[PDB]
Design a protein around this ligand. Sequence first.
Ligand SMILES: [Mg+2]
Ligand SMILES: [Mg+2]
Ligand SMILES: [Zn+2]
Ligand SMILES: [Zn+2]
Lengths: 96, 336, 48, 1360
Amino acid sequence: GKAQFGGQRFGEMEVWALEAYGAAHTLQEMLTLKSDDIEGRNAAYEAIIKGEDVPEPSVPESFRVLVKELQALALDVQTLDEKDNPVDIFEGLASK
Amino acid sequence: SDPVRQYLHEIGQVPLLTLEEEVELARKVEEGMEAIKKLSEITGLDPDLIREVVRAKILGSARVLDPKTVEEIDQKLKSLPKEHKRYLHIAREGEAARQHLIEANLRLVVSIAKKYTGRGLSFLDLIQEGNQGLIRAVEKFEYKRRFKFSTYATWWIRQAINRAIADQARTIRIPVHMVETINKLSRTARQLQQELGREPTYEEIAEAMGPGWDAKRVEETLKIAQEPVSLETPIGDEKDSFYGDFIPDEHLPSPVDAATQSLLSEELEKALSKLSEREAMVLKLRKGLIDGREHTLEEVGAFFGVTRERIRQIENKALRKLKYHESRTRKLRDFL
Amino acid sequence: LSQFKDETNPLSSLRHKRRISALGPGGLTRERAGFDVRDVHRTHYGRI
Amino acid sequence: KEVRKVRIALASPEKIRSWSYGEVEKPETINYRTLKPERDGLFDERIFGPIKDYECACGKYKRQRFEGKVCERCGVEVTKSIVRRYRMGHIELATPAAHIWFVKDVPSKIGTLLDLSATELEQVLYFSKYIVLDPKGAILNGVPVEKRQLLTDEEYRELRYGKQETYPLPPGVDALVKDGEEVVKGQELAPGVVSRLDGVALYRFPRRVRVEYVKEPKDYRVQPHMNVVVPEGARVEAGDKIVAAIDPEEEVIAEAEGVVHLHEPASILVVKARVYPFEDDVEVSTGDRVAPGDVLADGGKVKSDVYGRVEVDLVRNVVRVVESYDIDARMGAEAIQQLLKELDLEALEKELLEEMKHPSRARRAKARKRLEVVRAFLDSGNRPEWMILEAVPVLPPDLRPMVQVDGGRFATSDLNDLYRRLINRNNRLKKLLAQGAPEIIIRNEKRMLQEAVDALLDNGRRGAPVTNPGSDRPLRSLTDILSGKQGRFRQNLLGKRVDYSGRSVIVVGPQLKLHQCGLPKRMALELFKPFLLKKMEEKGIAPNVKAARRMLERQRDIKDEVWDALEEVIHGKVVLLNRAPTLHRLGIQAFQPVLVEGQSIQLHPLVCEAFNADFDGDQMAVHVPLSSFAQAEARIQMLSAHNLLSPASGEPLAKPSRDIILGLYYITQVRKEKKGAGLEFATPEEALAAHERGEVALNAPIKVAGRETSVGRLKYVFANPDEALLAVAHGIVDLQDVVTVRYMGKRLETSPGRILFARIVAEAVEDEKVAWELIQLDVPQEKNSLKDLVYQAFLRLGMEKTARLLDALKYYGFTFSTTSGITIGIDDAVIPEEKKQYLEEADRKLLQIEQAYEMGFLTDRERYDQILQLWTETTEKVTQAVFKNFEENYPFNPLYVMAQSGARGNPQQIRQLCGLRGLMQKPSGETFEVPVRSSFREGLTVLEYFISSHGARKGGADTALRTADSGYLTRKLVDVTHEIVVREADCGTTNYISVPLFQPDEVTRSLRLRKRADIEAGLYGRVLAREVEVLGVRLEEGRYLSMDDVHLLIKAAEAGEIQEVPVRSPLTCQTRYGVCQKCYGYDLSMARPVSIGEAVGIVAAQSIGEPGTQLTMITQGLPRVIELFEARRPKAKAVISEIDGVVRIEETEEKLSVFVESEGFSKEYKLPKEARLLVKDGDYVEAGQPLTRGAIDPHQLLEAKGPEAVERYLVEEIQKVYRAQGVKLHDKHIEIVVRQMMKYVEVTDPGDSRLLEGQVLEKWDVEALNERLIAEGKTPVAWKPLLMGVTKSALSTKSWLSAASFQNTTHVLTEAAIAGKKDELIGLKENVILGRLIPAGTGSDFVRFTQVVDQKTLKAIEEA
DNA sequence: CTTGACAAAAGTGTTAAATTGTGCTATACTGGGAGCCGTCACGGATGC
DNA sequence: GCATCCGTGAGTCGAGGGAAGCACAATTTAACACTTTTGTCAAG
Ligand SMILES: [Mg+2]
Ligand SMILES: [Mg+2]
Ligand SMILES: [Zn+2]
Ligand SMILES: [Zn+2]
């Protein structure tokens, strides 16, 4: 919303347009760097004002919310690697 | 499919107690309670422990202290002579009567609970809270006074229902004493509202409350009594907008705020570079740029092996050259 | 049915008071309304 | 490392407790006064972490080095506050509660494992019926109780506690039965009451006691507060008490020795029990349970004779054993959990495998459904009992925040309310259990606890939805958060709000280039702020970035050098313009921003059609790609000037439009004169001589000597275009006057405007010779001729020169339309002189029709039809008269020119302006008998206007309700094909499809050539599978079919040299998870072979779905397409012959039958009376050939004919809808979707495998499994091709993430968690959800690893 | 550079008010109440 | 066979919208003073 100084909604159909174009990196930025990659969006702004290229993005926070909401439903959602070993996307902040 | 209808049907399968039946059950509970005390005094066991064992046996094996210690205590009671075993029988009959007395009065709580609906707790929640008061009524009820059970149980059922509303009807819990104040304030405002033919101001409400009340306290009480608003309340006829969509997150630093903090550190590091190899470490320790916490002059001294006056001289010297370097360059005033 | 008054100009306020809505509490639904309720009936002549 | 797979599985209570950092024991959220979280509450800091970074709750540790330290005063770990978003708690349920996802999701997973119906499971779970777990030798109604039997509450009380009944005696009357006397059923107890069961009759409250002294029948009265302390017939010595009382004054004693007799009982209790008199101490106590052979009293003398609950009566000194059994029956999830714990999945699988051989299909079908659930739990490693929750996980509090708004008010989510009720009910259940509350109270609380869990997990799934008190709005549960259009998937994962994004109204920029846009300065300053701050810091505008940002905060503080820096910032860069709805991929395009003064975005005219954008108030969003990758993708792939052709059809999409066509058509159209128009002469000088006399006009067609020419072609002969256009400037001739011009060495006879158009193309493409070959000079430039010019320029020159040609056409088209003089007046809508004559003829015929009707020669229905035919024929004639008048008398009429050139309008709309409005339809569908005989120029009457409003509303309502249907269809098509990507150059398959060139016409019963647009849509840009030799031209195998090749093939077909073309299509492609380059063909957007890594599945779905809104203007239109894509069985389905043979009609008055006769077979088809048979006697029909008119069932066609026939039918019938509406769509896009529909198969013979008969799995998997089984010499799996709709095909995909984000989120997740499904992140949706690089475009493995290096950084490396 | 003086702030200890939690009240009282159709239509899947 | 239950229905924007009282104990918290660190001024 303009009143809230808000961004433009990049809905599903707009995402499909980037997928059809093949703009994998343009789509990835709008999903992570410009929306909810908290570490990515802070680094992207800092890199630009220093004259550098924006860094490689990271996992979005919305997916982190999805994992936690799925766990609250007693569903064990685990992100694995090539060798099926679990990968911690919370950076050790949720592991006891 | 209706939980309320299902409960009402279940309580309807227990016939209501006549006066003769009610007195017999009340007498048995009173006799059973006394026998438990006699058993505990003779055997030396905890009166609560014997009551649970007697309660556990009466309730049967359909209820999950481990069962082995129940059996050992039960066998110990059964080993007593006939005179002492007679109190075990009275305890068993008393506990069975207590269960029957509670079940046969489940209609009384429903009649009371139906008058508390709409105050923050659902109808079934009101009933179960009232049941807890009904159980306490059975323990405290005395048939010697010849008062009917409905006379005494009503006080305990209403108490449990009213207390539960004060403790569970608000997302942000408010103590009973403050909840009572809010109800009294609402009654006073309502009574004044009809008398004045308009909404009373905080001055009229405060005067009617009595001594110790002013407009400030009435205003604060109303502010406390504000329930939190749901983040999922829709706005507009279209069901696509909610409260949470308009509340910014002011906890996490913004990208601008995070960037200027890193810019400040880089500029501060360059300023500390001009300082001596010894002064910079002292200043960063005193300002907590290394450990994250400030260090007192003695601790900084204990770190380097000098008295407190040395650090206070180094810090005042390191902090003064930075003023000179900053003034002669003006590369650090913007961050302030 | 209690709507923020549309008073861009005098005609705006006049139009709003004369609007007839099939929606609201006790009426049709914006997505559950078929073509029959949305058509111009022959009896709309002179009335709607 | 790097995330490659995502796995979902059931969470055990051990895992749920391992997740939790502490158990939430209290429902308190925060302190109401201090506003700090309460200990053990839903927001507790010791559980979920500190509120603020590196600071305990007790204010003792406030530094970072204490990271990893837990304060010993408050217990709060000293760490980042962001852990509050990630750390979970748990609630330890007093009793287990079933997960509603595994109960109410049909078919129930718990019920399937336990073989319990949905009703049976609900009754047990919600404490309606008991389930037996240990009968303990219980007998019910003479029949022993077996395990897993459901017992109602009445039956359980009977088995567990026995039979008893109390009969209230009337006051005063005395019972006829004594205390402790056995009775039988129906025996009278008192004079007025009779028993209903056999048992021991016991006096309840004896109102009178009669003692007999020996010296004396004294009688004593018993009150309600008095109880008798002695049994009946008891000898009472002097002084012994008889009746006990509260007051000793009213206590009853005995004067002397006597016997006590009890009388006047209040009621009789008849209980089925055994009475055992005893003399010594009893070894049992009240409430114990005994069995035969158990000792009761006297040290073994008295023993139990039957099972039951033992109760000892001290008054009567007898032992009563109420006949009952210690049956183990339980309700709720605790009973279900015990059953699921006891399941032996290995043994259950063996039994189900044994039952899989049952001859009955229903028995086998049921066994497979149970066994699929059993197999899922066995292979995944999950436990069935994990479906019942013992500990409820608690979401991190930052995901369910209780935040304070700027006004001081508190805002919280509904999950806190749902959690509080669960905790409030759980804590109360623990208190009730500790107090030994009766079963009715405990059962009610357990039922609420189960319902509280189900409201938290999925509110409203079972029972009435939970609403916050004081409102009727249902609370949002965890299921609602993840499901629906407002759920996490579709609102926050598949689409997001983005930074560096703006929006403003759009206006037309005619001066812009095709690759440019008008970006307002104020928008660009905010969009490019971080870049601008760096540039401002570089120059002297600001000292640093922070001071630069302060300058931009205030509008009056911005200096004039900032705008100069902003120009430097955006140099070279591009922005993305987006207009919603983004129906196809051209809804987002990249433009080079041009800073303009104002607040509106300037849009190039040529991109309006792709954007579907006009300038009546439209708005667009601006997005700023940030990195070099994002900028490179937009500048190379997404640039507007690079996407000139339509990916859907391959035709130009950025082409001349309304004003551009109008200007170019006007100058290229020639004038026709009528002054001379036929005069013949002897010499040219005579023909010219007449012209100066005024007898013949300049462009009047005359004959000079023998040839037909005009005066203009003789009077004016120009040496070159420069002289011709110089004469135009001097007013000697007009652009529309036909003259003789010497161009390129050929003496042309054309107008200067056509010569001017030739020079327009020649200068734009900078090649006079090639441009001459690209244009059609001898015709006015309409929409289609200009479209052909753009396509030919694209092929011969490329994107760069075509974009230059497009701008030149736009500039001159805009320039000429301004000075040409197009305007619309009331007289421009010319009324034909034939309209009055036609209406008089129609009225006479209409009056003639009525007279025949009044004479009774025709009925109402045929008269109604005949009236409609008359007006339909009259309306068509007026349309002819309207346009015929235009092309004879006003060839340059503004309505005619706009319609003819394609700029605006169609013959239907022109007639309503110029001829008559025509017939109108009632809201019921019928058409009014009287039409609207008045045009818009004459003006409708009041009645005619109201009659016309019926159709206008229906059309408007149709448009509103069709956008939802078209948008839903596109989403289905995306989700079924999103994973299809060109992944390799060639899959090596030798299969193909033979695209037919001739269509089986049935009205003439002959093969006729298909339409050229139809053959192009099925052959353009396709790789030839086999060599074709037509017209002396050898089209080798592997050759991509261009438009020239397609046209050549049609030319050969017209000569009877070829009937069908074998081409490679996605239908026969063997590439897994996509297609190959050679099976797709050309990138219709670039008219060249498709590049590996393109997301053709997304392009195909957008190509099909974009014209859905235009489709609707048996079923036809969009509803026909939807049922075709959903593989639905039509209501009026056609009857097809299952076998081949000759048809034998046996029509009789009674009924209609159709017989197909073969060598030995004879199939009978009982058609209805009103069946439009399309097959006649003496015809040989093949399998799957329709016998009756209608829509063929694709599933019946698949079984009767085969997988290839149903695929061909689906593609052809979907195209019929689009072709009938004028929409051009390549068959590739439909075949990509149909390929996904035919992706699955059904097993018919398990063979030497573990697969089940009737199991559905992907065709690739079974073929791969089959070739594997052959390798080790085993019987292969026999399968059967299967067809399913786009929704069913999408929902049965292998990846659970994409399926859950599409629909049936609860159903998809509940199956995936049980099966432990691992998502390999193969398609596009899964990578989009995780924010990864999609495996398409620049993210495809084919191109992602490409390296770039110069010849000096490479040469030095080569040395080492 | 350290010693000592020197004092302001910060840190323990008591402790009174202020606040919060818990128990109790005895004529007799014993099975709820809001909803209530333009019920949305339609395809699919299950079931008996 | 049919009844019956379940999930589905375009996008962006926009603005407006935002009915108990008491006693008594138990715990918590403001209020206070004394001593202990820390900080500072002098001196040599
Ligand atoms: Mg528009
Ligand atoms: Mg001449
Ligand atoms: Zn702490
Ligand atoms: Zn292929």
